Ligand binder design. Structure first.
Ligand SMILES: O=P(O)(O)CP(=O)(O)O[C@H]1O[C@H](COP(=O)(O)O)[C@@H](O)[C@H]1O
Ligand SMILES: O=P(O)(O)CP(=O)(O)O[C@H]1O[C@H](COP(=O)(O)O)[C@@H](O)[C@H]1O
Ligand SMILES: O=C(O)c1ccccc1C(=O)O
Ligand SMILES: O=C(O)c1ccccc1C(=O)O
Ligand SMILES: [Mn+2]
Ligand SMILES: [Mn+2]
Ligand SMILES: [Mn+2]
Ligand SMILES: [Mn+2]
Lengths: 284, 284
């Protein structure tokens, strides 16, 4: 499921999580109430409906606390599964002390990632019957980019760039510094001709100015729906190969409206910066 | 503003943030569009109203990217300031290249921490005229506990425990393993007699059972307002010294209603697990 750098990202996050929990001493309450030889069957069950993501991270949290041979998975659901309230995402058998200590860290990761995949899916359903794909941004939390990114993919969106040197994206602050969108575009092309180039426009005027330069993608920043319609109309007639991406004034209520204008992508920051946790509990 | 461990935490977070942005190559678009000698005056300004928190983290991000003597702060607001849309939280003068590279990492942190402080303050205002204090939980994001915990305090909340060995808290799964709340309570009392003890009850029945044991705090889990009122009446008559904390079915709409019952605290998970970013931009 997770790739190598995602897996490594997950391990680093679960380690930071456990360290936050354990740095003040051991789990005194678990140690005191449950014997070392105790063993139970527990299930991660959703208190609500949504799309599940990050189940492997649950397994990595246990590997860290109990060791690979410290637990047994009697059953599990697959990442990306649409799930109702009360559904058992995974049933385990493991040393009780290990589960009570690992509980919060593992639940915190799975609820966050599931919350993103559940949101992402909402957006994906909203623009169904359209050609628009939902994309994320770099408005991710430090240390969780690979995981948050993985989660939007699980819900059906498509990742944008993972970093700064990943692809070029000429922003308002660059244009300001370069003095002109076409100047900046030209500069980026000359410096990194092999790198994907996206140019951000703030108006129909700038839009007209960059279409002839034929950048890979144009990001329509904070365009009203009527302006997005015009943009697509101009792109379609003047530079059929330029992809258009809406970003800025996007809400789930307007997603379809923008998608219907014919844009190729909707870039949603909310997907990673304003996530509502999917409520999950560990039941014994 | 930030303490030593919070500072070390911020530093670790900013470093993980920058590494995510730079691991694919340098900021190609900035290097190409802005000269090394470029310098600007920039401001972090809110696109929305809210409470500000995490400004020092912005500075720490610049120290890391431009070095201490790489910039100058012409003006700044204090953490915890209630702020309107379009307010300039901090005005800097710095090398342009350094700002554009630091921008996203610093913005993502300040936005996150401010979103938390903004939400916390809404809860705090909600229970105003009551004696209840708003507290957080361990439902924090991995690697960000110290910072998230710092933010609820900036918003007016009061921190709960920071980890597992920090204070004792008997939960449902412990009760399940110990076979009883009173059993579990007795066990913890024997193991860590010097440690603060909080026990979680799911019913007025368990409440009656633990009140005589006189634990430090009792967490009323998912009680209706009427049950919360009853519990306050029983506590007041049977164990005046026992503090009560509501946690579970809390919404900002009901906050005051529960606070009015006379409980000492409201423990809010949403404060740290479902945060809506405060929208902030770097304007040059
Ligand atoms: O408002 P700006 O001057 O364009 C600065 P900003 O840091 O917002 O720039 C980015 O944010 C938007 C990302 O999706 P969302 O809006 O949902 O968060 C998009 O406008 C981006 O180029
Ligand atoms: O539903 P449970 O069986 O009590 C498991 P859970 O992990 O929810 O247990 C904790 O969550 C609540 C925290 O505040 P919030 O609800 O806002 O997130 C509270 O019930 C806690 O003891
Ligand atoms: O994070 C951003 O500012 C952003 C917002 C929208 C599209 C893409 C990006 C990006 O840089 O990849
Ligand atoms: O994270 C939790 O389950 C939690 C929830 C509410 C209060 C306190 C805690 C805690 O363990 O400190
Ligand atoms: Mn933008
Ligand atoms: Mn914006
Ligand atoms: Mn609970
Ligand atoms: Mn719950």
């Amino acid at each position: 499921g997770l790739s190598d750098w995602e897996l490594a990202a997950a391990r680093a996050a679960i380690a930071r999580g456990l360290d936050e929990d354990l740095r003040y001493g051991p789990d005194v309450t678990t140690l005191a109430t449950v014997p070392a030889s105790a063993t139970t069957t527990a299930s991660l069950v959703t208190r609500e409906a949504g799309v599940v993501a990050g189940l492997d991270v649950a397994l990595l949290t246990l590997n860290e606390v109990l060791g690979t041979n410290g637990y047994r998975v009697l059953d599990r659901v697959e990442d990306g599964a649409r799930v109702p309230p009360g559904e058992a995402l995974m049933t385990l058998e493991a040393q009780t002390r290990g589960l009570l200590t690992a509980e919060r860290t593992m639940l915190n990761l799975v609820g966050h990632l599931s919350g993103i995949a559940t949101a992402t899916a909402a957006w994906v359903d909203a623009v169904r019957g359209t050609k628009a794909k939902i994309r994320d941004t770099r408005k991710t939390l430090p240390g969780l980019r690979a995981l948050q990114k993985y989660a939007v993919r699980t819900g059906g969106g498509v990742n944008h760039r993972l970093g700064l040197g990943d692809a070029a994206l000429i922003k308002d602050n660059h244009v300001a510094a370069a003095g002109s969108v076409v100047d900046a575009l030209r500069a980026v092309r000359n410096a990194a001709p092999d790198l994907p180039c996206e140019v951000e426009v703030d108006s129909l005027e700038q839009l007209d100015a960059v279409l002839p330069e034929k950048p890979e993608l144009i990001l329509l920043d904070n365009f009203a729906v009527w302006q997005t319609q015009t943009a697509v109309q101009r792109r379609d007639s003047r530079a059929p190969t330029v992809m258009l991406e809406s970003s800025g004034g996007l809400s789930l209520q307007t997603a379809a409206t923008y998608a219907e204008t014919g844009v190729d992508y909707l870039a949603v920051g909310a997907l990673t910066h304003s996530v509502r946790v999917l409520d999950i509990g560990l039941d014994m």
